[PDB]
């Protein structure tokens, strides 16, 4: 009751979240310096223990947050994200987790209010995009299957798999080395390969243009009214 | 009369189109697995016959649809598309048709209502573009002819044909390896080649920008009113 | 007087301009077929004389047009363009003119009304762009001079001239092989070369974005009112 | 008093700033010609002294400007820029300053009113971008650290440093040789490298799209009202 009110008044105070922010920036500087190998021979003893103390502080502070807000902490996406980040950082995963630990720096966007505002502004335009995202995914899946069965035996590196055909169709979509890297080599053996790729590029570019216009008229519809 | 009303009540029922949708997704999974050669040695006997039964079901179900709606089925673009897809899938074409058979997966967009809504939204912005499309096609045709007669003998691979000059001008338009892949090699022998290509890129980029702005002010004109 | 009224009624009749249009499309087909060398061994005798008769018809028909409208023909940009095109096509220029002759196909846009409408729509957005065009040209000129004097001796092919530095800065602007083609080779000898090019790319991209937004708010300003 | 009023009437007269403008354009022509080495053997004696007289004139004329407007000259960004430019041009820096001297040509934008108007129009859209700029910088910093610690030992040239990982992530962002130049070489040894780069590209492209839409709705918000 009084303990609760006092400890919640600590958890949702400014100085608490500010202290967490400043641990975040200091530890961001830390992880920036830890990529330097000469630096690590000299100061690795210190930098590792600094990461240890920040992570215990974070785990304690989500213990307090989750104490204050039991169900609503798990109903809240930002705190859900802080939980899952410190949890990943807490697990001892074949070293692939060491690189995942630096995701804790993303907590900066959850701790600081303006960053939180812009990333929710970013997520909010995604609902309107689901229709075109699914249209494009189906178009890519149908074309990936055709590109695989058309070019897979003679070009195993680029189209031998459904997965590699996704990859290289996605490359083509970004128009990166499309004709010189993939189409023209293909035409040295399959001469009408452009019949598959020119339409692919045209439809993909037009749908991608329509995606971005679709966004604007949404941000404008909330504006003119 | 009563038979008609009963069989039309079956054809335009939800469960019918839903069953067709679920055959579509199952067969999409099927065609996804059929690109895998090891999978096919094991289960090709089954996967081929699954494709056989889905295609007979589709042909039966367009027989029913076309029965219900004789003229209007052929006046309807989505059903016209389903007809032509199953028809392609029904024809025994030098194996080039085997890859065309996976176009049947596109029926998913015609069967499901939201996909149908977004692709007609996509087609509908095309009318407004016809003017600029034809302007660009004429500009490409005039430039393709000049690039052919300017660079064709000394660069047969890139400009020896009107068709190859279309191709490589289209490549340049996507700005993919423009100077490094085509212009600079050309300048090693024809030093003023940039006089042809820099304007080409400028006019092409400006017209393409104007295309996309042209789209927005159309989607906005239906909005502000 | 009556002769005038009758011959002007012929020049500004539909069938006259339509006949000119159909000569244009036939001759476009002609010039398309003339790039084919095997075709020319067979039918070059005919195709050349077809180009001769169309060009005499065009010169006669601008003689009539300029007869009808003396000063205003020269005050009119479309007719100014037809004049200069047939004039180029009439001059016997070291064969560089043979390729310029196909510019006569552009007369199609001047003869047909809808094409004329869209290309003036295209020209009309250019006035608003003069400010940013001149800002960019000054920025390119200042940077081209620095890139020349910084990298010209050790990289004569890319930056040895002010002209070659324009060219390759323009290439960088289109982001085509920027780091792999130019920056990274430069850094193998001049390690801080990115200090010149990263800002260049940032400012160039931001100004180019601002150019395109600048266009939209103009096309919208004529709309919301 | 009277001297002041007379000398301020000279400094803020048109002909004064116009004369400075014409020195600027003449000296721009000069610096354009100075990159030419054959030109310099012939006329370098003259061109260097021309640059000497223009720079003394500029230093005198900012002496007069700063005389007229003591505090407000330093409170004014355009005059602050002219000051710092002539000051750089006045310092005798291991020849790295010789190339910086051509920045004096940028004074043209500060002297001429329309250029001044468009560049402040350009700066003014930057405030609204700070939120997304900082979001992207944090995302790049977190990913640069992961790309360094994931790929640095086996790819020292592209990811051996935090700085080189910034560079090549920025390259990927411009989609320049992404898969062919970096991802596919990486996959020859680290096969799941796309799990790092495909998301990177998706999030980076979406945030960059949102940046540009963010700009438009700002330029439109000042318009519809
Ligand atoms: C919002 C996010 C802001 C991001 C701003 C980023 C500012 C820093 C970017 C770093 C750019 C330079 C990196 C670099 O040059 O790397 C070199 C070293 C590794 O080399 P090293 O092995 O030390 O080689 C020594 C060679 N020697 C003896 C001749 C000197 O590698 C390093 O030493 C890297 C040192 C990085 C310092 C950390 C900077 C933290 C900035 C603030 C981030 C806080 C937000 C979480
Ligand atoms: C986060 C919010 C929404 C995100 C929007 C995108 C959502 C859809 C994402 C794609 C869904 C399909 C994923 C997929 O098919 O994965 C297949 C492959 C498997 O890779 P793999 O076969 O292991 O790679 C081979 C390379 N090797 C052997 C030499 C190592 O892995 C890949 O190659 C994937 C390549 C990129 C595929 C992108 C597909 C784009 C579809 C439409 C995207 C939206 C456009 C607006
Ligand atoms: C709206 C459209 C949604 C699209 C979502 C796409 C999700 C699936 C993307 C597939 C990405 C991965 C593809 C891939 O990795 O290919 C590998 C195999 C071929 O290799 P394989 O010859 O089996 O090599 C065996 C090697 N061994 C023995 C060591 C294991 O190739 C395969 O096995 C591919 C298996 C694909 C499964 C089908 C997935 C269907 C997803 C739902 C689509 C329904 C809408 C029509
Ligand atoms: C679906 C809705 C509307 C679509 C908008 C585009 C409509 C216009 C499409 C193009 C019309 C002209 C087609 C054409 O000229 O085809 C010529 C070539 C023939 O190829 P080919 O000579 O067999 O290729 C040689 C390569 N080889 C020998 C080594 C195998 O084949 C090609 O290389 C074609 C290359 C692409 C040409 C694109 C022309 C773009 C014009 C404006 C496009 C619209 C921009 C908004
Ligand atoms: C608004 C503008 C519309 C533009 C639509 C463009 C439609 C035509 C695009 C041409 C695409 C194909 C070009 C092509 O494949 O070139 C091959 C030949 C040159 O090869 P050739 O030397 O004949 O080799 C013979 C080989 N052999 C004996 C085994 C057959 O090269 C040719 O034969 C080219 C023939 C082109 C025919 C002219 C088409 C005119 C279309 C309408 C344009 C009118 C508007 C002015
Ligand atoms: C039509 C309506 C308005 C058009 C907007 C653009 C207006 C401004 C155009 C550029 C003005 C300056 C032209 C210029 O500086 O020409 C220099 C070079 C000379 O070439 P050169 O030195 O012969 O090339 C060397 C290659 N080699 C020896 C191996 C054969 O030739 C080039 O390399 C030129 C390269 C492209 C320069 C583009 C400069 C862009 C400035 C801002 C463009 C507008 C962005 C919105
Ligand atoms: C708003 C900004 C407007 C910018 C407009 C730019 C117009 C000029 C662009 C220059 C493009 C051509 C550059 C070029 O071709 O470079 C060649 C020479 C260096 O070669 P060089 O060593 O002379 O070789 C001689 C070879 N020989 C004996 C056989 C003739 O290199 C040169 O001679 C370059 C000469 C450039 C002349 C200066 C042009 C000033 C234009 C107005 C700028 C005023 C605003 C500040
Ligand atoms: C002017 C108004 C606002 C401007 C917007 C951008 C503001 C943020 C800029 C970037 C801040 C971080 C700078 C940084 O981390 O510098 C690190 C490296 C150090 O280079 P270094 O390690 O010496 O390069 C190695 C190459 N070598 C050894 C072979 C010579 O140097 C680099 O490689 C930098 C590479 C480009 C980094 C761009 C980061 C973009 C973040 C978001 C950009 C805004 C997107 C809208
Ligand atoms: C919504 C729009 C949908 C657009 C869909 C378009 C699909 C069209 C795909 C075109 C694919 C072209 O791929 C085509 O494959 C066949 C099948 O082997 C090749 O066929 C042949 O190739 C060469 C011929 O010199 C030989 O090695 C061999 O005799 C044979 O395999 C064709 O020469 C090639 O051009
Ligand atoms: C709406 C805008 C329209 C823009 C249209 C612009 C068209 C301009 C095209 C410029 C083309 C340049 O192409 C030009 O071709 C001629 C004709 O052989 C070459 O001429 C020469 O090339 C080299 C010279 O070293 C020699 O091999 C040879 O003696 C000769 O063929 C020129 O050196 C080349 O620079
Ligand atoms: C069936 C679909 C209907 C077809 C019509 C749809 C449009 C298709 C256009 C062809 C696709 C290739 O698209 C190519 O993309 C590149 C991207 O670098 C464009 O380059 C772009 O540069 C600027 C700067 O970003 C853009 O504002 C502009 O849209 C475009 O000019 C090429 O100018 C464009 O041609
Ligand atoms: C509006 C924004 C304006 C932005 C303007 C930015 C301009 C900055 C330009 C940075 C250019 C870097 O170019 C720099 O040139 C000098 C001058 O030789 C090189 O200096 C040195 O290079 C290498 C060093 O290993 C040696 O061969 C040699 O001893 C020497 O020439 C630098 O190492 C290089 O990094
Ligand atoms: C006669 C025509 C009038 C000439 C003026 C018309 C504009 C011409 C611009 C030069 C054309 C090259 O166009 C080049 O396209 C590339 C596409 O990757 C742009 O790169 C682009 O990145 C972003 C992200 O998409 C775009 O929002 C932006 O438009 C542009 O900066 C280059 O910045 C631009 O310069
Ligand atoms: C907001 C979104 C955030 C997205 C973040 C995504 C991060 C995911 C990064 C995936 C990185 C893949 O990088 C992965 O690195 C490990 C660690 O060595 C490699 O592991 C192995 O590589 C090869 C295996 O043949 C061998 O040389 C060796 O035995 C081993 O090092 C993996 O095979 C590689 O695929
Ligand atoms: C001082 C200036 C202020 C700096 C901020 C201005 C923005 C600078 C951004 C960095 C420039 C590189 O710009 C790079 O252009 C490429 C063009 O292929 C973009 O790729 C683009 O793809 C799509 C499709 O066209 C565009 O709608 C979008 O704008 C962008 O994501 C990269 O995502 C972008 O990062
Ligand atoms: Na490229």
Numbering used by the authors:
A (entry chain A), B (entry chain A), C (entry chain A), D (entry chain A): 999 to 1090, 1094 to 1226
Authors' own words:
Among BacNavs, NavAb, cloned from Arcobacter butzleri, is the most critical contributor, since its full-length structure of Nav at atomic resolution was first resolved. Here, we elucidated the mechanism of the divalent cation block by reproducing the blocking effect into NavAb, a well-studied tetrameric sodium channel. NavAb has three ion interaction sites in the selectivity filter, a high-energy-field site (SiteHFS), a centre site (SiteCEN), and an inner site (SiteIN). Our crystal structures of NavAb mutants show that the mutations increasing the hydrophilicity of the inner vestibule of the pore domain enable a divalent cation to stack on the ion pathway.
Previous studies have shown that the N49K mutation in the voltage sensor domain raises the activation potential, and the −140 mV holding potential can sufficiently maintain the channel function. The mutational site of N49K is far from SF. Therefore, to provide a stable current, the N49K mutation of NavAb was introduced into all constructs of NavAb in this study. In the ionic pathway of the N49K mutant, there is no differential density of the calcium ion condition subtracted with the electron density of the no calcium ion condition.
